[model samples]
Target chain A: MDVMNRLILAMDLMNRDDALRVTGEVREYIDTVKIGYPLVLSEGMDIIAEFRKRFGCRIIADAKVADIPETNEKICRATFKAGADAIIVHGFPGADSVRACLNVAEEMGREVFLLTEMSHPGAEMFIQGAADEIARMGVDLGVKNYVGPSTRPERLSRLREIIGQDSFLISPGVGAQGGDPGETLRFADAIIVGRSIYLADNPAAAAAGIIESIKDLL
Target chain B: VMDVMNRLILAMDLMNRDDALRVTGEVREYIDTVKIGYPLVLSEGMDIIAEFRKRFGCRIIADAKVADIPETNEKICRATFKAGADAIIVHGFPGADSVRACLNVAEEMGREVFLLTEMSHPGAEMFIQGAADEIARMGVDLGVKNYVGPSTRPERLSRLREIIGQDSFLISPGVGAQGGDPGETLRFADAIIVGRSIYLADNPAAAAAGIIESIKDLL
Candidate 1:
């Protein structure tokens, strides 16, 4: 669960070769990678294991699982079986569905990170309104890890306050998404960066510069 | 694309590909559209969609319930359609842009996107229930022509149909094992989605036949 240097790479490049190549370039600065459906659906779930074997890094399957309890359990089971260190689930689906994921993750000794709200503009429609209750629900369900948005510091800070200081919190939307690395770290235990680093001409330098910017707090 | 026969769509939830294929094959005579979710696809691979199409020539509605950023949503729909899914389910609560992302891909790929307004499960009340009507309205505003509602709640299903109008295609789940009556559900939904009650039955084909028999008068 340790996010080395307070950074997690969102390895979203659709193809495996490019994803692996870019991740390898920034391997030194990041110890955790967020692999969403874009990569997994494109290259297959084996890519989770591939990232694990090559960099010895923690892999977060950002599948955004949203379904009934029965299907939620199966999605979590398949993800954990594919070697994901943790799986991100949507809290909007309600307690039973989230519990389904928790049960399987607990049984397999894996972790479930509840995604309270997304950072994207479209998230404002419904997710933003339900985010507080979702965070409260996660707390009531004994969830230990969370994913919040770095795009809105106020909302992220509010989420931190709701989940309290003890839980492990991660925030996405930094860098390319216009979130400040240092500002995001004030609330998030780690900052998730994607296109900013992965799409850079010198990915290693991009990651290094991000780490350097936040070195004082680290 | 062939219409869903017997007003039934199999919710193939089995995680094992062999078991899934076997059970789905057993009931092939009863249904022509299969609602394959993450349970089967994530367990085996996306290729399983193509496998089902090749074997049964059934219309595969990938119940992906896609809820992601516009960029990511587009990618998911692309991969799903690339694997030969005729239609994919998407969540409207994620807002117009996210739903639009899937619509764009489906339009370009000549596929369809089914907007899920509300769910049958209890947890849906916490959030999805409150936003479902607005979600449905958003789908309509965006010119979406297909939708999914909960069969277990016929009143809600009726409301959803009223909102989407009679012309747009609509499907409902929660029948069979979830206690939704096939005939009762069909009063509102164009078709009913059934899973565990049929797939887990000792004789899946018989189970599918029995359910269809009860609703034969309506058909």
Candidate 2:
């Protein structure tokens, strides 16, 4: 729940040795790591347990789970069973699918972070238009965590306004994706940075710089 | 990969690996393509994809419904293909770049991408239905050759077919437990995807055989 330094590392590297080394290097700068299919599918779901064991940090599975409710429930169960502190799910699959993930997370005492809008340019096509309703749907469902895009501040700010100050919002697209960490944290509880940190010659320094820029807010 | 023989795809939604393999093997003679969704893959691991392929020699479609940013989408497709999937199903609602990411990976890996335009569930009307036509249009513009639609709604399936045209390969789900008649579905879809009806049947082979018999006249 409490994101240390208000920064979550988006570990998207597909190679395990490199991912682990970079994460270990920056372990002191972050307390929560967002692991997606790149790392999990390449290495295995066991990677979640490995991160938790080695880093002693919270693991948020950025699975972008989008499926029918029955299938969604199965994915949530499997993810939680693998030791994820939370799992990110897509809101476009409709309320029932999101609810399925919520129900499993509740039962397992884990969390489900609903992704309302993405950060990519292509997101403008459909997700950007439906984002407000998607956030409203999350509110209606009693969801407590959400993922928005830092690439667009207005959209991120609007999402924060819709979800209210009580809910937790994490935004991705900082650094390599061109989102400023300080600006992203204006609305988001934490700024998710991937290549900007993982691909750097000095990952720890990269994480420290981002944290330094946002330390006043932290 | 090849034309889906028998025009039927086994929607292997079962979460248990042993049971999933058994049921799939039982009906293997009637179908040559199987859709492995997150349920089985997450429950058992992505290796279940190769397990099905080794056992049945059927084309494995990872019905992952991949929805994510372009970078992450590319990684998901990379990992899926490395795990031995013949093709991977992706949601078109995420827009062009995300879909293009998957298409790019599929191209590099010598695999295929199935753009899912409209889902078969009731909740699809909330957002996907409004966007299904444009999603299909996007796929056509991107030069996508395969797609997934809902057999539950014959009219919508017909409309999707018209949108993609007869040249693109289209598969439909929602048959059996979802109330989609196999034959009626085949009228619009090149292949019909059936799940619980056959997998949960006491005699899965018989269930598959019965459905094929009913559609024998069409075949």
Candidate 3:
């Protein structure tokens, strides 16, 4: 099977109707779908299974799993059983939690994404100075994927160089938050777009435009 | 003036549905919203929200305070909305992009956004009040329709009200455990969000009614 590069869209605010509408309109334009907190809590994991059945594309549970190892493992299994291709664990959840999530993912053959840094202003307080430490930790644990947000395009190259190009890099804050696609593509395996496209006057057209803009870099 | 503000009472520190339902029933007459916080949301899940909505006939706010990438946040937001939440609270600390992503999703889906300014805990004063000025400035253009602030002190309410202004809805918590006067809170806020005060009260209905009467003059 040819590995298609990841192009993920966050259906953050869309209701069931809105999600169905967006999926019907833009499903062909994007590669994967993430079911966030509001939707997941409102609709349940059954909704994710429903989407998987409907689109037959990659589904990310995006639960941002937190808590103890046992609870984490149980939730991770539930997500996979719900048909999630990738499960997220917060880095703040600590190394043991990440390792625990990784163990479960490895057992189930599911992908695990660690939230190393957020796209917000104070992210540097945790991520920037700590990149080496985080990379070293991930390397030591044999973990393969990490998530971070950066406004400066140079950071992507720096992250890529540090973590190695083959490591899965998920970049958020790309379109509406003033992030340049040229810079994001330099390091990311998947680019997460939220309001930039989903809230656009014409979401489908906006989504297509974003896909075109990043196609060259990919 | 039309009272556009909707009150939110968080069902925190409760362990069972009997306690949850009793609290909801008591405050049902005064408050228009309830929050199934981490404790309740995790323990009970969708069933809690559904039960609250079914019995109270009020709006439900899933106080998940979600902070994650666009994908996870989006999925949770959609699911919570489907569970019948009129509004969802997400962490503003996730950065502008995350908030933007959530707001976009909320707008597209027709749900309201409650940006968390601070909690009602003792240490929260340092963050919610201290950092609120900057957060409010950032929200000037983000289309944030509501703000959550600690109601432990009258000064905090006044300070947040001054910063957020009258246009945005304010959800004031800390009424029960903290002992802040509901009348004093109503002076600066449009709505009051109570938790332990009503949920843990000996007669929840009487306690809720007392607060409701206290703020009646303002409405």
The model with the greater lDDT, 1 or 3, is: 1
Residue A169 in model 2: lDDT: 99
Which segments of model 2 are wrong by more than 4 Å? Answer: none
- Compare the candidates by lDDT and give the number of the best one: 1
lDDT of 2 by residue, B63-146 (tens): 888888888899899999999999999999889999999999999999999999998888788888889999999999999999
- lDDT score at residue B28, model 2, on the 0-100 scale: 89
Q: What are the runs in model 1 whose C-alpha is more than 4 Å off? A: none
**Which candidate should be chosen as best, given TM-score against the real structure?**
1
**Candidate 3 at B101: error in angstroms?**
12
True contacts kept of 1: 0.77
Query: What shift in Å separates residue B215 of candidate 3 from its native position after superposition?
Result: 35
lDDT of 2 by residue, A27-104 (tens): 998899999888877887888889988999999998898887877888899889989999999898799989999999
TM-score of each: 0.98, 0.98, 0.57
Alpha carbon lDDT of residue B43, candidate 3?
Answer: 47
Query: Which structure is stronger by lDDT: 2 or 3?
Result: 2
Candidate 1 TM-score, C-alpha based: 0.98
Rank the candidate models, highest lDDT first: 1, 2, 3
Assess candidate 1 and give its lDDT.
Answer: 0.92
